[PDB]
Design a protein around this ligand. Structure first.
Ligand SMILES: CCCCCCCC/C=C\CCCCCCCC(=O)OC[C@H](COP(=O)(O)OCCN)OC(=O)CCCCCCC/C=C\CCCCCCCC
Ligand SMILES: CCCCCCCC/C=C\CCCCCCCC(=O)OC[C@H](COP(=O)(O)OCCN)OC(=O)CCCCCCC/C=C\CCCCCCCC
Ligand code: HEM
Ligand code: HEM
Ligand SMILES: CSC1=N[C@@](C)(c2ccccc2)C(=O)N1Nc1ccccc1
Ligand SMILES: CCCCCCCCO[C@@H]1O[C@H](CO)[C@@H](O)[C@H](O)[C@H]1O
Ligand SMILES: CCCCCCCCO[C@@H]1O[C@H](CO)[C@@H](O)[C@H](O)[C@H]1O
Lengths: 422, 108, 49, 101, 271, 442, 59
């Protein structure tokens, strides 16, 4: 008759980190976190990381393409791969009694791929399809251009394989990528609904692709460019950012809070966001439908901060300028001490809700257990957050109005202002 | 192909002319004589063979072999009626088929 | 918009047992089919004969 | 001893597909398994196979064979498709076995 | 090419029925008695046999109603042959022709015209010379003189032998001294053809590169030659034994040796 | 083990405030929680004149109450980091909040204030009238939803389930402040509602704040009366909306389902699990266990397809839906109907074994977070009048076998007249009669 | 509930529907022939050899 439990976390000699947790949930969710991504690609192998993501179901040295799929489905399990510009996660879910079964596959996939030429050739046209459905959201398109304007390298690389390379990625390229990035010291084997002694055992007795830090990624160099895609759509999506804070950077929370102070997404269905400086400000400017939000990304060696808007074409001008004023105004002490209190609530709440779902929890554990083989207590994180002065926030706001900006906009940009008119 | 009715070289044909064949939704009874004619043909042939198997083509035996057919062959008389009248049925149908054609400009 | 679309009224055609909108049509289904299929089975008998 | 080897070498020469310049594997009947294996061959191995075959069909229509010096030698016959073919059959049996409950 | 092959076997059977009913028409001694021997074969079928035979005859023996219905059949069947030929060719075109090397010819195909239209016209005139030479210089070389004598229901010819193209099958029919056993043997002698596609064990399609199968193939051909010869002789020693041997080896080569040797050959190729 | 984890799950507690309301909640140790009120109301309860009222209400249920106007209501909710969402369907409505367990009580007050004292600001109403009209044009491009609306429109033609949740254009243009008011009063009533909460909350502390804000008790017996709705007649038929200008075509085929309370639903869900679903991004590809999915991949039969068992109080819709190019509709429909026949006729033990596992992890996944668990509770009491544990479900799922699947499927599918809805470039989809024939032998 | 019973037992399964058509034809034939043969003989009482026969029968 089960109860509470600890969040153990070993760290073998080769550098492989092992974090587990037993919440006695009838469902287990193991995963292999890795420091890999389009960030480590160079001009020569662009998109190789995208394809590698889709390559998860291909045959391995231990399991055939057929058995990987049939095996996992046999026990109502699942296998997926999520990835960012700098990290890749391979996770499987299934009922407790099948963790063994499902494990063999997760193992094989991440450490024993065969990238058979024919299988790879056959899979590449999928990149077109995958990319096609993703790009249905305008969001995804401008964020690609954004990173391409924000940086000159690494983080500048797109998350989806460029068109000229579909069908040109090779098996050697996939192998070399996995060999120089999927190294024991860049991986973490996180698990939920499992026992540490068990998960720990699987790792050491099965994980063989060995140690090293593999090929290290180039430093992210800021550019501050401007990309404009004139495609005629009735709505204009635009994002303006500035070099923000890095992951772990003390100046992080400051932006996180400034984010919520400005407006970080709706909280009421079909409702207006009054606690949103940015939304409310833009609202006062235009009469037509729109949307404005505080954009914020934190990467290993850098970050981006700014606002993302969506508006009718004719009112794109005023909507974007209105968003800017809300940032200046905030940089000029226009931030109440109560605003900072509320934001700190929404921020503590958001973080706390993020971990309700198994996917969100496992991701929280793993992410940190990967970038520092540790685990901050939900109290220390809260402790760190609220201990952010109104000064800090106003400073963050300043760093934005003063720093060099990069912009990306798509749609009928006939009325969309240029970065140098902001 | 997922279903035989479309892939098989023979069924494909039966399917494209008698199962999946696209037909106007409003064709009347005047469009029935085509298939009736086809059935007359199959019918005439069938009864014709049955008669041929007892017939004798010689001016001294023709008339009587037909009599022998109608008088001695089991259902000989029936088969002969069906063949003889079937020919009339055939012409009735071909004349209506033609009329339909002329009226509705099928000749185009 | 599609919201403004409704299926016309087929009362001038519906079989007696499915005329009422507040009555399960499943209770008269086996009879409605049994009947139609009876006609067919009968034609097959006459034809076989 | 070398009995089996002796026999195989005799048959190879007795068969005679080497007089057309064909490798043993070029002569396989293209059933389902073989067709799939062919699709996995690397570009060059595939184009070479094609030339050898087109060339043999030419010899066949001309009613000629290659000059004795170009006949493939039993020990130089390259089993280029066998490896692939085996994997293909191995996979098929797996599916077959697995689909039997 | 299974469907092409199977329709092909139907064509052989139909051509045979055609020749049989056609050969009865002149109504000579051989026409009558051969038609008697053949139609009476069906009476071997248990239970329904006697019934089917008298039905086919239209009476109690081969007679006038048998003749008139045979004429109708002979007139009709050739057209069934023509129709089924279209089906034959239709299945064939799904894949196109096979070739002597048994390897794909997609890399080297040519338009039927003028290559094969010319080649075929040539083949026609080459085989037309023997035909016409036989027809014009030896009209009766292949026929029984017994068929120049009007059918006599009361006198059976001393030596009742079938047309050359049915001899081998006749030889097989006689090999089994048992009435019903002989019929089955005969049936199988032709229906065996439907089984050929399932007895292929070779990894190669043709016998071009299979020396063992080639010997086996010519034995079979020679075996058919012997049966043909045996079928034209009277049932008496040594023929009777030679006949049973040939019949037996005929079925043996097709049912056992061919697939066995086929497997043996795959191993010698290290497959 | 698995079994053990199912038994050790905290029980769901339920209590009733004699005014007619039920309060249920499952307790965990989470600093965060979700609480909301699930009402047994929807478009089915509306009629020709007030169709789309419940939707119109869903638009104002968040624009302020009497005790606190718009801005005030919003600021208060926003400023505490809570999320306010809700929805309205054909037989069910819900308004729920996500926040810190530390505020469970203030939230309960907020909920009660929403369902009881909606301001129905005369001016806000005219403002939302124009918003709702814009959402109807947006949703009109959602083929999938246009298709399911049409499926209901014909499957339940002549009845209440035939109407869409959003309502008619005419109704939206003429609904009165009085109508909405009337709607709320007629339907948002204690006995027909459920206060559900999940997370780290005290059941007793929940029930208490409940008594305080949901107090109004009933005197007569008719005030504790939950009106049984008139039956909705299923009709085998088809509606075909053709527009060859649309890139792909949507098709949905269904037969009448049993309705919530029926145990057979456990089997229909196992059945749907065998057939599964698919879309062009399933890495598994040609190796997927779902036969229909495999065929779809091999023959490129469709962009996607999904099975479904939509339940209701007294009826339901069991069927499937697919999106395909105008030229592969016929083959897809063919294979689809083919798989349905194989279900009633040749299902295997191996097939159910897999489908059962897939179904178990499916149910467990519908309890991933506070909101989804809270949604289970609201729905369960409202539909089964009680919570059904994963352990019970598992108990029922475990009893299902091949034979059972065939019998139940043969029961609801075999030789039935289906309901058909097709939208887009559907010239290749054969006629009703041909589809009807796909309902037997195979 | 004949139509209902008939449907479930005979017309539902394509197999049973076929057996029903066979026995149906069998029963129908027997009944239809005898009936038709009666109707015919009745409409011709005293004219068939069946009717006259007795007068000259003397075997
Ligand atoms: C049935 C009734 C039987 C009636 C009697 C049968 C008639 C007997 C007359 C003999 C026919 C003449 C055949 C002589 C041909 C000699 C010849 O050329 O053989 C060698 C030659 C070499 O070919 P490749 O291996 O491709 O090599 C080419 C370069 N790489 O082989 C061939 O021509 C192929 C064989 C085809 C001929 C088949 C003819 C046999 C006919 C009789 C019926 C037999 C089949 C019935 C089976 C049941
Ligand atoms: C004593 C007599 C003995 C009789 C022996 C013959 C036995 C034959 C039995 C075969 C089995 C028949 C069953 C067929 C099953 C297929 C089927 O679905 O039914 C037929 C099916 C019906 O479809 P549904 O209504 O959707 O039924 C679905 C029920 N689940 O198709 C039909 O309508 C066909 C039946 C109509 C026959 C048409 C013939 C009319 C023509 C008249 C001319 C007269 C005949 C003369 C013949 C001359 C030939 C040389
Ligand atoms: C287009 C189809 C056919 C038509 C229009 C047709 C028409 C006729 C007509 C007009 C008669 C004379 C009937 C009489 O005695 O008054 C006849 C006789 C005959 N037909 Fe045909 N016939 C057809 C096909 C066939 C076929 C295919 C055969 C046989 C293979 C055939 C065999 C006979 C025979 C044997 C007779 C002579 C016996 C008799 O007159 O009853 N017929 N046919
Ligand atoms: C009236 C009888 C027949 C006719 C008119 C006929 C005609 C043809 C034609 C026109 C071809 C293509 C040219 C060729 O390859 O020769 C062909 C091919 C073929 N026929 Fe026949 N055929 C007959 C009987 C048979 C029989 C008895 C068999 C086998 C039992 C048969 C088996 C085949 C096969 C398998 C092919 C494929 C040839 C290849 O290897 O490419 N045929 N036939
Ligand atoms: C009408 S008698 C006959 N028809 C032939 C042409 C035939 C028989 C079987 C199959 C095809 C063709 C044949 O050889 N005979 N003769 C004959 C003589 C003695 C014994 C058997 C047949
Ligand atoms: C089986 C009934 C056939 C009726 C005759 C209709 C003619 O002729 C046509 O030839 C094409 C190419 O072979 C086929 O694909 C078509 O289906 C066929 O109708
Ligand atoms: C002229 C006769 C040609 C042979 C008929 C082949 C027809 C089948 O051919 C198919 O259509 C391809």
């Amino acid at each position: 008759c089960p109860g509470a439990e600890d969040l153990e976390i070993t760290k073998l000699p080769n550098g492989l980190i092992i974090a587990s947790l037993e919440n006695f949930s009838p469902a287990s969710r193991i995963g292999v976190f890795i420091k890999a991504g389009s960030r480590y690609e160079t001009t020569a192998n662009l998109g190789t990381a995208h394809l590698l993501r889709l390559a998860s179901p291909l045959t391995t040295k231990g399991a055939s393409s057929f058995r990987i799929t049939r095996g996992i489905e046999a026990v109502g399990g699942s296998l997926s791969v999520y990835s960012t510009r700098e990290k890749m996660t391979y996770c499987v879910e299934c009922l407790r009694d099948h963790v063994d079964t499902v494990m063999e596959y997760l193992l094989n996939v991440t450490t024993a791929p065969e990238f058979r030429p024919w299988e790879v050739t056959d899979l590449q046209p999928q990149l077109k399809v995958d990319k096609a459905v993703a790009f249905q959201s305008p969001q995804v398109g401008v964020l690609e251009n954004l990173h391409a304007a924000a940086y000159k390298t690494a983080l500048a690389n797109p998350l989806y394989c460029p068109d000229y390379r579909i069908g040109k990625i090779t098996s050697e390229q996939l192998h070399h990528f996995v060999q120089n990035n999927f190294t024991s010291a860049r991986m973490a084997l996180v698990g939920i609904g499992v026992k540490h002694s068990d998960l720990k055992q699987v790792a050491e007795q099965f994980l063989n692709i060995r140690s090293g830090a593999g090929t290290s990624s180039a430093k992210a160099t800021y550019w501050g460019g401007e990309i404009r895609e004139q495609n005629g759509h009735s709505l204009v999506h635009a994002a303006v950012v500035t070099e923000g804070a890095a992951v772990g950077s003390a100046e992080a929370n400051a932006f996180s809070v400034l984010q919520h102070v400005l407006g970080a997404g709706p909280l009421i269905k079909r409702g207006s966001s009054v606690t949103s400086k940015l939304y409310q400000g833009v609202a006062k400017a235009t009469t037509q439908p729109f949307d404005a939000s505080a954009f914020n990304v934190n990467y290993s060696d850098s970050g981006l901060f700014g606002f993302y808007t969506i508006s009718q074409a004719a009112h794109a001008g005023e909507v974007i300028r209105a968003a800017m004023n809300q940032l200046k105004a905030a940089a000029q002490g226009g931030v109440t001490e109560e605003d900072v209190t509320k934001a700190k609530n929404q921020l503590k709440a958001t973080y706390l809700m993020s971990v309700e779902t198994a996917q969100g929890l496992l991701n929280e554990i793993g992410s940190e257990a990967l970038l520092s083989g540790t685990h901050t207590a939900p109290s220390v994180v809260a402790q760190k957050i609220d201990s952010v002065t109104s000064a800090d926030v106003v400073n963050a706001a300043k760093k934005f109005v003063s720093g060099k900006k990069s912009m990306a906009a798509s749609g009928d940009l006939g009325s969309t202002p240029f970065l140098d008119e902001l | 192909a997922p279903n035989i009715r479309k892939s098989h070289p023979l069924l494909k044909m039966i399917n494209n002319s008698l199962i999946d064949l696209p037909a106007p939704s409003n064709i009347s009874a005047w469009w029935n004589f085509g298939s009736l004619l086809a059935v007359c043909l199959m019918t005439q042939i069938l009864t014709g063979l049955l008669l041929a198997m007892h017939y004798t083509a010689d001016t001294s035996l023709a008339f009587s072999s037909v009599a022998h057919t109608c008088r001695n062959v089991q259902y000989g008389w029936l088969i002969r009626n069906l063949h003889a009248n079937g020919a009339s049925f055939f012409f009735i149908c071909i004349f209506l088929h033609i009329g339909r054609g002329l009226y509705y400009g099928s000749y185009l | 918009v599609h919201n403004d679309v409704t299926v016309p009224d087929f009362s001038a055609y519906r079989r007696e047992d499915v005329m009422d909108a507040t009555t399960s049509s499943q209770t008269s289904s086996e009879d409605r089919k049994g009947f139609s299929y009876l006609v067919t089975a009968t034609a097959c008998v006459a034809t076989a004969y | 001893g070398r009995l089996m080897d002796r026999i195989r070498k005799w048959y190879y020469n007795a068969a005679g597909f080497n007089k057309y310049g064909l490798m043993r594997d070029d002569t396989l009947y293209e059933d389902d398994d073989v067709k799939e294996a062919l699709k996995r061959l690397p570009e060059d191995l595939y184009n070479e196979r094609m030339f050898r075959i087109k060339r043999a069909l030419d010899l066949s229509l001309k009613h000629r064979i290659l000059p004795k010096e170009q006949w493939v030698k039993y020990e130089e016959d390259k089993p280029y498709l066998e490896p692939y073919l085996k994997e293909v059959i191995r996979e098929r049996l797996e599916r077959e076995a697995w689909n039997k409950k | 090419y299974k469907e092409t092959w199977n329709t092909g076997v139907i064509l052989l059977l139909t051509l045979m029925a055609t020749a049989f009913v056609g050969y009865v028409l002149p109504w000579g001694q051989m026409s009558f008695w051969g038609a008697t021997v053949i139609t009476n074969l069906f009476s071997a079928i248990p239970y329904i046999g006697h019934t089917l035979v008298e039905w086919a005859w239209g009476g109690f023996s081969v007679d006038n109603p048998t003749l008139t219905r045979f004429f109708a059949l002979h007139f009709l069947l050739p057209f069934a042959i023509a129709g089924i030929t279209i089906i034959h060719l239709t299945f064939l075109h799904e894949s196109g022709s096979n070739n002597p090397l048994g390897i794909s010819s997609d890399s080297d195909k040519i338009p039927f015209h003028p290559y094969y239209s010319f080649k075929d016209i040539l083949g026609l005139t080459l085989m037309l010379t023997p035909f016409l030479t036989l027809a014009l210089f030896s009209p009766n070389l292949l026929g029984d003189p017994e068929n120049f004598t009007p059918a006599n229901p009361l006198v059976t010819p001393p030596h009742i032998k079938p047309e050359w193209y049915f001899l081998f099958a006749y030889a097989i029919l006689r090999s089994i001294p048992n009435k019903l056993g002989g019929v089955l043997a005969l049936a199988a002698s032709v229906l065996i053809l439907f089984l050929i596609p399932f007895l292929h064990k070779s990894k190669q399609r043709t016998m071009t590169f299979r020396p063992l199968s080639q010997t086996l193939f010519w034995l079979l051909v020679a075996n058919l030659l012997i049966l043909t010869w045996i079928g034209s002789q009277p049932v008496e020693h040594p023929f009777i034994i030679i006949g049973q041997m040939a019949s037996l080896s005929y079925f043996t080569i097709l049912l056992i040796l061919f697939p066995t040797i086929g497997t043996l050959e795959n191993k010698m190729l290290n497959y | 083990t698995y079994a053990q984890t199912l038994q050790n799950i905290p029980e769901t507690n339920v209590t009733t405030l004699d005014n007619g309301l039920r309060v249920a909640s499952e307790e965990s140790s989470q600093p965060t929680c979700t609480v909301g009120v699930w009402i047994g109301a929807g478009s089915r309860y509306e009629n020709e004149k007030n169709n789309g009222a419940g939707y119109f209400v869903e638009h104002l249920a968040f624009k302020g109450t009497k005790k606190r106007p718009c801005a005030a209501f919003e600021k208060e909710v926003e400023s505490m980091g809570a999320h306010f969402n809700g929805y309205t369907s054909r037989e069910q409505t819900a308004f729920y909040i996500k926040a810190l367990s530390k505020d469970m009580p203030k939230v309960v007050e907020l909920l009660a204030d929403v369902v009881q004292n909606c301001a129905l600001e005369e001016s806000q109403i005219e403002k939302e009238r124009g918003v709702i009209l814009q959402e109807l044009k947006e949703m009109d491009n959602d083929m999938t939803n246009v298709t399911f609306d049409y499926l209901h429109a014909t499957a339940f033609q002549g009845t209440a389930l035939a109407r869409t949740v959003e309502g008619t254009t005419e109704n939206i243009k003429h609904l009165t402040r009085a109508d909405l008011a009337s709607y709320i009063d007629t339907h948002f009533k204690a006995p027909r509602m459920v206060l559900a909460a999940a997370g780290g909350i005290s059941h007793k502390e929940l029930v208490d704040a409940a008594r305080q804000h949901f107090s109004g008790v009933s005197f007569t017996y008719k005030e504790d009366a939950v009106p049984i709705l008139p039956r909705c007649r299923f009709t085998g038929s088809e509606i075909r909306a053709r527009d060859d200008a649309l890139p792909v075509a949507h098709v949905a085929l269904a037969v009448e389902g049993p309705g919530w309370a029926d145990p057979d639903n456990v089997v229909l869900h196992v059945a749907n699990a065998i057939i599964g679903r698919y879309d062009r991004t399933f890495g598994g590809g040609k190796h997927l266990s779902s036969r229909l999915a495999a065929l779809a991949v091999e023959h490129k039969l469709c962009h996607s397809f999904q099975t479904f068992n939509t339940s209701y109080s007294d009826t339901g819709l069991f069927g499937f839906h697919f999106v395909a190019d105008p030229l592969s509709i016929d083959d897809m429909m063919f294979c689809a109907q083919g798989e349905w026949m194989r279900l009633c006729t040749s299902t295997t033990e191996s097939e159910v074994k897999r489908a059962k596992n897939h179904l178990r992890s499916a149910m467990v996944a519908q309890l991933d977070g506070t909101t989804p668990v809270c949604e289970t509770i609201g729905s369960h009491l409202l539909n089964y009048g009680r919570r059904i544990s994963l352990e019970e479900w598992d108990s029922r799922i475990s009893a299902v076998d091949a034979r059972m699947v065939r019998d139940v499927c043969s029961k609801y599918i075999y030789d039935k007249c289906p309901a058909l809805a097709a939208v887009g470039p559907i010239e290749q989809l054969l006629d009703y009669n041909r589809i009807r024939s796909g309902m037997y032998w195979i | 509930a004949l139509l209902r019973q008939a449907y479930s037992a005979l017309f539902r399964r394509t197999s049973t529907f076929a057996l029903t058509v066979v026995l149906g034809a069998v029963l129908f034939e027997r009944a239809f022939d005898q009936g038709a043969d009666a109707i015919f003989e009745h409409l011709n009482e005293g004219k068939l050899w069946k009717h006259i026969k007795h007068k000259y029968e003397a075997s």
